[PDB]
Amino acid sequence: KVFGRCELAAAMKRHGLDNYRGYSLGNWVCAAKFESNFNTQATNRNTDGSTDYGILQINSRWWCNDGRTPGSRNLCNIPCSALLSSDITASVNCAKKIVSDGNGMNAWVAWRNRCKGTDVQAWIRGCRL
Ligand code: NA
């Protein structure tokens, strides 16, 4: 599924991500834009052989099991494939654990490099929320 900007903002709000760990909804929409272009089926292989999955590009190194990332953990207790669902519940649940891990949204390097410090409210501008 390829979400629209306000459609994803609504889905993230419904799943309690808005102001989670102090991150406003535009921060989460911005991170999703640059991680996946709002595509739930986005996958990207890392140089270290881990893979990133779904709207928030969650990494098999730590967070989900894909069976092909040696030495990795599965701290969200999910198959990485669940992060590719049209239903964002698994991605949201796992993103809440990631953003609680101690470095906040810096865990998402695209958030640090493209969202952090910017006018992230622009991402939810005009959305009925
Ligand atoms: Na893993």
What is the distance between the terminal CA atoms of the chain, rounded to a whole angstrom? 20
**Structural domain boundaries of the chain?**
5-124
Given a contact cutoff of 8 angstroms between Cβ atoms, the answer to whether 50 and 63 are in contact is no
Q: How far is the CA of 57 from the centre of ligand 1 (A)?
A: 13
Resolution value (Å, 1 decimal): 1.6
Task: Please tell me the distance from the alpha carbon of residue 76 to that of residue 100, in angstroms, as a whole number.
Answer: 12
Given a contact cutoff of 8 angstroms between Cβ atoms, the answer to whether 11 and 38 are in contact is no
Catalytic positions are 35, 52
Local structure of residue 128 (DSSP, 8 states): -
Give bridge partners of residue 45 from the DSSP assignment.
51
Query: CA neighbours within 13 Å on the CB side: how many for 98?
Result: 25
Q: How far is the CA of 114 from the centre of ligand 1 (A)?
A: 26
Residue 66 marked ligand-binding: no
Given a contact cutoff of 8 angstroms between Cβ atoms, the answer to whether 115 and 99 are in contact is no
Residues lining ion ligand 1 (Cβ < 5 A) are 60, 65, 69, 72, 74
Q: How far is the CA of 23 from the centre of ligand 1 (A)?
A: 26
Could you say which of 1.10.530.10, 3.30.70.940, 3.90.1150.10, 1.10.760.10 is the CATH number of the domain covering 5-124? 1.10.530.10
